[PDB]
Amino acid sequence: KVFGRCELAAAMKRHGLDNYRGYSLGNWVCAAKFESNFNTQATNRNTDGSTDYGILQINSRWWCNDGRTPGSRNLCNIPCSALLSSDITASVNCAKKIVSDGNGMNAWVAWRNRCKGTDVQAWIRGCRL
């Protein structure tokens, strides 16, 4: 599923991401935009052989199991294919764990490079929330 901007902000809000660990909703939406273009089905292979999955491009190196990343962990205790559902719940819960590990949102390279220090509120401007 490809979410619309406002539609995803609303889902993220309902799932408890608004100001989660101090990151306002615009950060999550901006992250989602640049990681996946709001596509829940996004997969991208990394140079190391791991794969990033779903709307927030969660990596199999650490966070989920895809059966093909030798020596990786599954810290969110989920199959990576759960991160591809049209329902964002698992990507959200896994994101909460990631973002609480010490690096905050810097875990997402595109957030550091494209959203961090920008007016992220623009990403939720005009949405009914």
Supply 61's token pair.
């190196």
Site membership for Cl ion, residue 79 (CB under 5 A): no
The residue from 69, 80, 94, 98 that contacts Cl ion (CB under 5 A) is 69
Site membership for Cl ion, residue 108 (CB under 5 A): no
112 is in the binding site of which of Na ion, Cl ion, ligand PEL, none (Cβ under 5 to 8 A by kind)?
none
The residue from 1, 34, 81, 85 that contacts ligand PEL (CB under 6 A) is 34
# of chain residues touching ligand PEL (CB under 6 A) = 9
Helix, strand, coil shares, percent, the chain, to 5: 40, 10, 50
* Residue 20 Cβ vs ligand PEL, minimum distance, rounded to whole Å: 20
Site membership for ligand PEL, residue 61 (CB under 6 A): no
Rounded to 5 degrees, φ, ψ at 45 are -80, 140
To the question of whether residue 66 is assigned a binding role by annotation, the answer is no
Q: Which of residues 7-26 bind Na ion (CB under 5 A)?
A: none
CA atoms of 56 and 52, how far apart (whole Å): 8
CA atoms of 50 and 121, how far apart (whole Å): 32
Q: Which of residues 71-110 bind Na ion (CB under 5 A)?
A: 72, 74
* Burial grade of 16 (CB within 10 A; 0-12, 13-18, 19 or more): exposed
DSSP 71: T
Applying CB under 5 A, the residues found at the interface with Cl ion are: 24-26, 69, 72, 104, 121
